[PDB]
Design a protein around this ligand. Structure first.
Ligand code: HEC
Ligand code: HEM
Ligand code: HEM
Ligand SMILES: CCCCCCCCCCS[C@@H]1O[C@H](CO)[C@@H](O[C@H]2O[C@H](CO)[C@@H](O)[C@H](O)[C@H]2O)[C@H](O)[C@H]1O
Ligand SMILES: CCCCCCCCCCS[C@@H]1O[C@H](CO)[C@@H](O[C@H]2O[C@H](CO)[C@@H](O)[C@H](O)[C@H]2O)[C@H](O)[C@H]1O
Ligand SMILES: [Ca+2]
Ligand SMILES: [Fe+3]
Lengths: 142, 225, 449, 213
């Protein structure tokens, strides 16, 4: 068992799995339209993604279980806060009332978002909540 | 939907104990302080204490340390309050209510859902059917365009009584007053106003039910003679 | 060689930034349990992006340091440009301090507007919070540095160590390019996000670590370059054979197909192997040291790195890498426990190892420091390393209770996010105390110079 | 303990108008004051917390403000469903405490009580007792005074009153006054009189009867 052998294994193995991976990536790409319900991915949801990004919600929250662990999972929040029909209205109040100012409690900032922006946010979180995620999270608490 | 269902009216003797329940539904029961609040008639709300079902910790107003014991049973999502060594001053409506905020360290906050209240009535009295007396207008004194009749219900225990007129079909122009304690017994009355070509040409009857003694009585109002 | 001195500003800067990173960790650790601490002046997410960007930037500086020191020695000649090393150092240091200031001095959305992020939205993704211009600046520095070290390898002696280093270094900078790709579809965004984070830290960064370790063992051990380089190839082969499909362990729940559940779990089950091999590597080749070495801290740093990387990356990684388990633990304090030990054990530790070998002989003191300095270095190693195990155990206990309270029961019976966190308070105070012992360790390490 | 004092205890007002009510704490409660609405047949409803934060789903016609020691609640344009009891509660410290309430009542035009007097029924008399009942019905506003007279002399003892709440249909009040005597004491006198004094007349409404006929 030589240096030369080890180096060829490193070479062959990397190239093979590099190609396998891109093949899987191509396939996965083709399935996304259905899994994510991209038909619904509206101008409102795509602007909501920008709002999410620009205010770094992910610096405190998880979404589909990724991001920070300071605050709740926002992927299924729509299920804890008025559902399909009342969630947008809830979110408008929720963004306006921050920070709650409970002494010693984890605090969320006031972002001074316009009502258009918060509505875009709500559509984005509503849409996110419906991605086929293989049944993640385990329950309504995220 | 977040809901709190409280148990029914309890009656007890002075120095006895009572225990009431509050069934929570529609939320994570172990994540929120459950508060209890006392309201005596004409007296203002008082905070008794709270239990945190996620770890069983409790907190009591100093005025209620002797009186109240609070517990919770997780599997059933139900909280309990036991009141001991009862006195007339413990006759009240008792509410349970949920912190509007989750978690252990929000002990002192405001509440977003309340139960409908449990009545505790502390008394030495005995179950007694009421006496029901028809009230006809003053003898011969018939003059005006409408006539008022009454029905006096006297000397019963416990509440409540239901009173109707003509089995409920006569319902407008009726005033039925809240009951008052006369010694240990309750009395109430009800009036009905009707146009004078209605009575005595047409029958008017007072119907009084007292479920606690299974009584139902009808008293016809008769002109005086 | 004389141009190896350019490595020095890089290691010094890295150590300064490392200090900043700890201070910001300590801030967040207190925010966990006094939730309005420093609010609204420095909200948690602001403290967080500073903590995590200072971690990446300091390691990047360490990597450049390491490459600047060993590449001339491997190539058997002077570095292509000592003056370029120095321009790049100032540009990278200035860009890093400027973007940190950005985060700290202007609310995030205001920083976004101001850097014109809406033309090319790259901001507000985890670990990628820097303005697009600031990312662009980092690419230019990486390109400069690659030309510099790469030209040196070209006109110069090729060795397998230097060529695996250059491969990792090139792959690092290429993969960073995916941070300019911000898909409008959330699932797609997450899919390519991991091409930066995972293919770095379980891929191309492993080539960098292994090559640094390999060079340090060549120098400290006097064992044969040939045998060392063969194992180095075995180790990176196992890293990429396990790790490329292993990316799938981040593809369980983001919205991509359920085949990733199988592919992700089976291949990532093997990602411990290269860390295990690095342990057998360092232990075996230090046991067979045909000579003794004046600096006994370097050897401790090298054995220490491999054990902690194996615990943090291999053992804690394996613990949560299987989908049926990850289902419950995803996005939990258990994640933070693994992330801390893995990043510290593999990457912070290897940077301190190369510094430990190279510092005395960049300062022209010799192979080693005097005996009082060497006991300090060792004290700082044990304090930092033991503290980090305690950080990991406390967060692991928090993660277990979090999963038990929040994730396992059914709706109604599961505890809410915020209520669970209050139940975890004690583990968080302990983590905070552990974090204090860590800073002390870092002070002790620094006072060893 | 912080004591809370709400004023006024009663406030009459009309649909479309604006009212504002007060809450005072005995010491500083910083900004932590909540308000509840109480209505017959419903559970208590959180309106505002932390002084001025509206609770989810509460219409924007409600608002409040204050800090330290002095707080208010405003309703901008009263709606029919807003006539109700309002309580404030501090949420700054253990033990939680509440004010005793402001009742917001529906104003309507003044109306004089309709007054009727009833001799004891003969069924009651055969059993020993004698209750004389006086109904004072459908009056507005709520302040009213009842005086019993037996043969022209004011009788104070043995009188029990009971009062309805504001009728949610015509917005008036009603009251009964019952004088309970022994049959014996009843038989000692002849003339029974109920007199109602109410702001709709400087002169009393007097109803009475003679035990004879
Ligand atoms: C840290 C400085 C935060 C940032 C940035 C954002 N949020 Fe947040 N959020 C934070 C905390 C500590 C909490 C818990 C509040 C409490 O007292 O209970 C929240 C809560 C929310 C919620 C409610 C979640 C629930 O499960 O009920 C939502 C919907 C929410 N936050 C949204 C949100 C958005 C859209 C953000 C980006 C603009 C955002 N948060 C940022 C802390 C922080
Ligand atoms: C030195 C190598 C590694 C480093 C620096 C590292 C670091 C990290 C970090 C920081 C996270 C959180 C990332 C995020 O923010 O979402 C993470 C996630 C994870 N790591 Fe690693 N890791 C490494 C090696 C590995 C290994 C070898 C495995 C497999 C055995 C592994 C398995 C996981 C898994 C399954 C997650 C997902 C956790 C979740 O879903 O919450 N890691 N890692
Ligand atoms: C005093 C020492 C430390 C403290 C108190 C601390 C604290 C934290 C906290 C509280 C978080 C955020 C978790 C959240 O999102 O809720 C975090 C993030 C992070 N820190 Fe530290 N930290 C410290 C040291 C370290 C060290 C030495 C490293 C090098 C490993 C490190 C690497 C990380 C990483 C990789 C993340 C992001 C993790 C993830 O997203 O999964 N930290 N740190
Ligand atoms: C080496 C082992 C590698 C295994 C790789 C393949 C794994 C596929 C297994 C499915 S992953 C995930 O697991 C979940 C159960 O653990 C499954 O959850 C199921 O039960 C849940 C509660 O028990 C319930 O909340 C879900 O709605 C129900 O679907 C989940 O669907 C599945 O995607
Ligand atoms: C170091 C490892 C860290 C600890 C995390 C490991 C835990 C992963 C193994 C999960 S066992 C799993 O627990 C689930 C929850 O109890 C259970 O879910 C089930 O019961 C639920 C009610 O509780 C209900 O949603 C469903 O009827 C049913 O799917 C399940 O029995 C069990 O497989
Ligand atoms: Ca993360
Ligand atoms: Fe990974």
């Amino acid at each position: 068992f030589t240096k030369g052998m080890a180096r060829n294994i490193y070479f062959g193995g990397s190239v093979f799995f590099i190609l396998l991976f891109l093949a899987l990536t191509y396939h996965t790409e083709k399935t996304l339209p259905e899994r994510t319900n991209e038909a619904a991915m509206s101008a409102a949801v795509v602007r909501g993604k920008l709002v999410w990004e620009q205010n770094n919600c992910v610096g405190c929250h998880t979404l589909l279980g990724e991001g920070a662990y300071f605050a709740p999972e926002l992927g299924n929040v729509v299920g804890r806060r008025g559902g399909e029909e009342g969630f947008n209205t809830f979110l408008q109040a929720w963004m306006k009332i921050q920070p709650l100012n409970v002494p010693g409690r984890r605090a969320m900032p006031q972002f001074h978002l316009s009502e258009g922006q918060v509505d875009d946010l709500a559509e984005f979180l509503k849409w996110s909540s419906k991605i086929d995620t293989n049944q993640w999270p385990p329950n309504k608490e995220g | 939907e977040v809901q709190l269902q409280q148990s029914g009216t309890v009656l007890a003797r002075p120095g006895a104990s009572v225990k009431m329940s509050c069934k929570a539904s529609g939320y994570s029961f172990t994540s929120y302080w459950m508060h209890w609040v006392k309201q005596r008639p004409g007296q203002g709300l008082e905070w008794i204490g709270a239990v945190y079902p996620g770890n069983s910790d409790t907190s009591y107003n100093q005025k209620f340390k002797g009186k109240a014991k609070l517990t919770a049973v997780t599997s059933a999502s139900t909280a309990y309050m036991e009141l001991s060594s009862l006195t007339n001053e413990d006759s009240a409506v008792y509410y349970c209510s949920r912190s509007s905020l989750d978690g252990y360290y929000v002990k002192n906050w405001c509440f977003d859902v309340w139960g409908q209240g449990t009545t505790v009535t502390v008394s030495s009295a005995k179950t007694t059917a009421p006496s029901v007396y028809p009230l006809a207008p003053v003898c011969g004194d018939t003059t005006g365009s409408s006539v008022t009749l009454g029905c006096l219900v006297k000397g019963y225990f416990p509440e409540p009584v239901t009173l109707t007129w003509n089995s409920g079909s006569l319902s407008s122009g009726v005033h039925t007053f809240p009951a008052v304690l006369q010694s240990d017994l309750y009395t109430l009355s009800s009036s009905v106003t009707v146009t004078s070509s209605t009575r005595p040409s047409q029958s008017i009857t007072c119907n009084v039910a007292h479920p606690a003694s299974s009584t139902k009585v009808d008293k016809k109002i008769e002109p005086r003679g | 060689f004389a141009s190896q001195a350019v490595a020095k500003p890089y290691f010094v800067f890295a150590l300064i930034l490392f200090v900043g990173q700890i201070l910001f960790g300590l801030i967040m650790g207190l925010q966990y349990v006094v939730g309005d601490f420093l609010f609204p002046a420095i909200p948690f997410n602001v403290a967080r992006m500073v903590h995590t960007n200072l971690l990446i930037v300091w390691l990047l500086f360490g990597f450049m340091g390491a490459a600047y020191y060993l590449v001339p020695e491997e190539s058997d000649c002077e570095l292509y440009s000592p003056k370029l090393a120095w321009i790049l150092f100032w540009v990278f240091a200035a860009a890093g301090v400027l973007t940190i200031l950005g985060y700290l001095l202007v609310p995030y959305a205001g920083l976004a507007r101001l850097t014109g992020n809406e033309l090319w939205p790259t901001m507000g993704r985890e670990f990628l919070e820097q303005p697009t211009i600031s990312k662009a600046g980092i690419v230019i520095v990486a390109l400069g540095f690659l030309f510099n070290v790469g030209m040196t390898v070209l006109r110069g002696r090729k060795t397998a160590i230097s060529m695996v280093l250059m491969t990792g270094l090139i792959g690092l900078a290429l993969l960073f390019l995916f941070s300019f790709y911000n898909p409008e579809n959330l699932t797609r965004d997450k899919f390519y996000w991991w091409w930066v984070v995972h293919l770095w830290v379980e891929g191309v960064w492993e080539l960098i670590m292994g090559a640094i370790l390999a060079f340090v063992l060549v120098k400290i051990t006097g064992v044969d370059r040939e045998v060392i380089e063969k194992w180095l190839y075995v180790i990176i082969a196992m890293a990429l054979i396990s790790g490329i499909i292993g990316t799938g362990h981040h593809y369980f729940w983001i919205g991509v197909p359920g085949y990733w559940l199988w592919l992700g779990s089976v291949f990532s089950a093997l990602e411990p192997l290269p860390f295990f091999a690095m342990v057998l590597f360092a232990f075996n080749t230090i046991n067979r040291r045909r000579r003794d070495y004046p600096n006994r801290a370097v050897a401790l740093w090298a054995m220490g790195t491999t054990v902690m990387a194996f615990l943090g990356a291999g053992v804690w990684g394996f613990m949560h890498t299987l989908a049926p388990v990850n289902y419950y633990t995803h996005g939990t304090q258990l994640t933070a426990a693994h992330g801390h030990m893995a990043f510290y054990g593999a990457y912070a530790m290897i940077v301190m190892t190369i510094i430990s070998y190279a510092m005395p002989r960049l300062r022209g003191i010799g192979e080693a420091m005097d005996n009082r300095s060497q006991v300090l270095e060792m004290w700082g190693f044990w304090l930092m390393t033991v503290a980090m195990v305690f950080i990991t155990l406390f967060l692991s206990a928090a993660g277990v209770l979090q999963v038990w309270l929040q994730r396992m029961p059914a709706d109604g019976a599961a505890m809410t996010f915020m209520a669970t966190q209050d139940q975890l308070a004690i583990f968080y105070w302990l983590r905070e105390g552990a974090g204090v012992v860590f800073l002390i360790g870092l002070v002790a390490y620094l006072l060893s110079f | 303990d912080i004591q809370m004092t709400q004023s006024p205890p009663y406030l009459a007002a009309s649909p479309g108008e604006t009212i504002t009510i007060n809450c005072r704490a005995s010491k500083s409660i910083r900004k932590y004051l909540a308000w509840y609405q109480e209505k017959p047949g419903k559970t208590n409803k959180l309106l505002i917390y932390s002084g001025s934060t509206l609770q989810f789903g509460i219409p924007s016609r409600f608002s409040g403000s204050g800090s330290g020691t002095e707080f208010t609640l405003t309703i901008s344009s009263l709606e029919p469903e807003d006539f109700a009891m309002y309580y404030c509660q501090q949420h700054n410290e253990y033990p939680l405490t509440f004010g005793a309430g402001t009742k917001l009542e529906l104003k309507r035009a003044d109306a004089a009580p309709t007054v009727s007097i009833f001799p004891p029924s003969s069924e009651q008399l055969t059993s020993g007792g004698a209750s004389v009942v006086c109904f004072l019905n459908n009056f507005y506003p709520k302040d009213i005074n009842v005086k019993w007279k037996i043969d022209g002399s004011e009788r104070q003892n043995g009188v029990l009153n009971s009062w309805t709440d504001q009728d949610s249909k015509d917005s008036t009040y009603s009251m009964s006054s019952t004088l309970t005597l022994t049959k014996d004491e009843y038989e000692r006198h002849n003339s029974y009189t109920c007199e109602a004094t109410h702001k709709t007349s400087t002169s009393p409404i007097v109803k009475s009867f003679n035990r004879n006929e």
